[PDB]
A paper describes a structure:
Protein kinase CK2 (former name: casein kinase 2), a serine/threonine kinase of the CMGC subgroup of eukaryotic protein kinases (EPKs), is involved in cellular key processes like cell cycle progression, evasion of apoptosis and DNA damage repair. Structurally CK2 predominantly occurs as a heterotetrameric complex with a central dimer of non-catalytic subunits (CK2β) to which two catalytic subunits (CK2α) are attached. For the catalytic subunit in humans and other vertebrates, two paralogous isoforms exist. They are typically denoted as CK2α and CK2α′ and have highly similar sequences with exception of their completely unrelated C-terminal segments.
In fact, the CK2α1−335/4p complex could be crystallized under conditions with strongly differing salt concentrations while the CK2α′Cys336Ser/4p complex crystallized only under low-salt conditions. Typically, crystallization conditions dominated by high concentrations of a kosmotropic salt support hydrophobic interactions. Therefore, they are particularly promotive for the closed hinge/helix αD conformation in which the hydrophobic C-spine is fully assembled. This rule originally derived from a survey of all human CK2α crystallization studies published at that time is further confirmed here by the high-salt CK2α1−335/4p-structure with Phe121 being embedded in the C-spine environment. In the high-salt CK2α1−335/4p structure this additional β-strand is enlarged to comprise now the zone from Asn118 to Phe121. This brings the Asn118 side chain out of conflict with the prenyl alcohol substituent of 4p. Significant conformational backbone adaptations of Asn117 and Asn118 are required to this end, but asparagine is well suited for that task because within folded proteins it is the most versatile amino acid after glycine with respect to the conformational space occupied by the backbone torsion angles φ and ψ. The lack of any conformational ambiguity in the hinge/helix αD region of the CK2α′Cys336Ser/4p complex is also perceptible from the final atomic B-factors which reflect the mobilities of the atoms in the crystalline state: they are low in the whole hinge/helix αD area of the CK2α′Cys336Ser/4p complex while in both CK2α1−335/4p complex structures high mobility sections exist, namely either at the helix αD (low-salt structure) or at the hinge (high-salt structure). Compared to the extensive hydrophobic embedding polar interactions contribute only marginally to the affinity of 4p to CK2, but they are critical for its orientation within the ATP site. As illustrated in Figure 3b,d there is only one hydrogen bond of 4p to the protein, namely from the D-ring oxo group to the side chain of Lys68 which normally serves to coordinate the α- and the β-phospho group of the cosubstrates ATP and GTP.
Author numbering: 2 to 333
The structure:
């Protein structure tokens, strides 16, 4: 008797009901454009797997953004392209415009529609209480959408959110780690950045689902309302789970482990030890007092749960009272 199986609470079969070509990205044949249509203007930034440029389409003189992919497995390029194509046109999802390949070096590059925005990590430590709620809600729109389309983002973090703060616009970017959810499928746990990895990743439970993204969202919320960047500041992968356990307590962690019959590393179990749960108000200070409300703490508590199946879905989050006034002014 190994680990207990798990299934997503919502959107479980959305890919099952789709035609195979929707999610079988390996069979998909990529129709590449002409790189000559694009000339690079200047550098915008650089990820771990890409270099990002401002560019111009010399066929309609439109501004675009080009993301030149650093060499990874060809299977990962088709997955990212297929996911971006499936999500194209969704609320707050970056819009893929074209796919091009270098004539000589054969390096693939993604072409996106240009939006004069800035990175969320440069803003999210200075927002008003209402602005935290507002942009959290826009992030949730993107996550509920992509989850409803059968896709887990798996790398939700401040650096992967873009803000056009003058137009109050938001985009969820970097779909290079995203995957299609299929019930019963076992997934790789080497996803997400350390500070935003869910406990299922840290204990090597492979049958996870969309709820992984909700843990990452909870880490972002905690960082914003408490002004602690990151909130769980683990120094290696084991220490990341220790930091979590020093907050949520070890009791609910071991219940989670036992619930899914997860075999933990012998020395790891002794590493975790015993820690009581800390009240969320223990992290409130005089300088983040204006950002912390009872509804904020109740919402955060309902995202940061060890048991991935107990976390709020994206739609349940959007109906949490924490967004009540945000939702009311969404009608103007
Ligand atoms: C205005 C500033 C500060 C940057 C413009 O950042 C943009 C703009 C439009 C579209 C994208 C990015 C961007 C993307 C991506 C990244 N960046 C940034 C962080 C360079 C990081 C690597 C992964 C990725 O995918 C991406 O798709
Ligand atoms: Cl980040
Ligand atoms: Cl599998
Ligand atoms: Cl995977
Ligand atoms: Cl910490
Ligand atoms: Cl969801």
């Amino acid at each position: 008797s190994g680990p207990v199986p798990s299934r997503a609470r919502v959107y479980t079969d959305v890919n099952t009901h789709r035609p195979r070509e929707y999610w079988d990205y390996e069979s998909h044949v990529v129709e590449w454009g002409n790189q000559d249509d694009y000339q690079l203007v200047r550098k915008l930034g650089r990820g771990k797997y890409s270099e990002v440029f401002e560019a111009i389409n010399i066929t309609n003189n439109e501004k675009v953004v080009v993301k030149i992919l650093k060499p990874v497995k060809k299977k990962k390029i088709k997955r990212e392209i297929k996911i971006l194509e499936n999500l194209r046109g969704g609320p707050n999802i970056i819009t893929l415009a074209d796919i091009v390949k270098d004539p000589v070096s054969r390096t693939p590059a993604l072409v996106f529609e240009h939006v004069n925005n800035t990175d969320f990590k440069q803003l999210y430590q200075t927002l008003t209480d209402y602005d935290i709620r507002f942009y959290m809600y826009e992030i949730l729109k993107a996550l509920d959408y992509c989850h409803s389309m059968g896709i887990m983002h798996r790398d939700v973090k401040p650096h992967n959110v873009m803000i056009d703060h003058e137009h109050r616009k938001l985009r969820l970017i970097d779909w290079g780690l995203a995957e299609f959810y299929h019930p019963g499928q076992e997934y790789n746990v080497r996803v997400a950045s350390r500070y935003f990895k869910g406990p299922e990743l840290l204990v090597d439970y492979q049958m996870y689902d969309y709820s992984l993204d909700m843990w990452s969202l909870g880490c972002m919320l905690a960082s914003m309302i408490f002004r602690k960047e990151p909130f769980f500041h683990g120094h290696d992968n084991y220490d990341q789970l220790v930091r979590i356990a020093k907050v949520l307590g070890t009791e609910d962690l071991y219940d989670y482990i036992d619930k899914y019959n997860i075999e933990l590393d012998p020395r790891f179990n002794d590493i975790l030890g015993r820690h009581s749960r800390k009240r969320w108000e223990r992290f409130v200070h005089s300088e983040n007092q204006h950002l912390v409300s009872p509804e904020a703490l109740d919402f955060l508590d309902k995202l940061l749960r060890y048991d991935h199946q107990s976390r709020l879905t994206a739609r349940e989050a959007m109906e949490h009272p924490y967004f009540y006034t945000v939702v009311k002014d969404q009608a103007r």
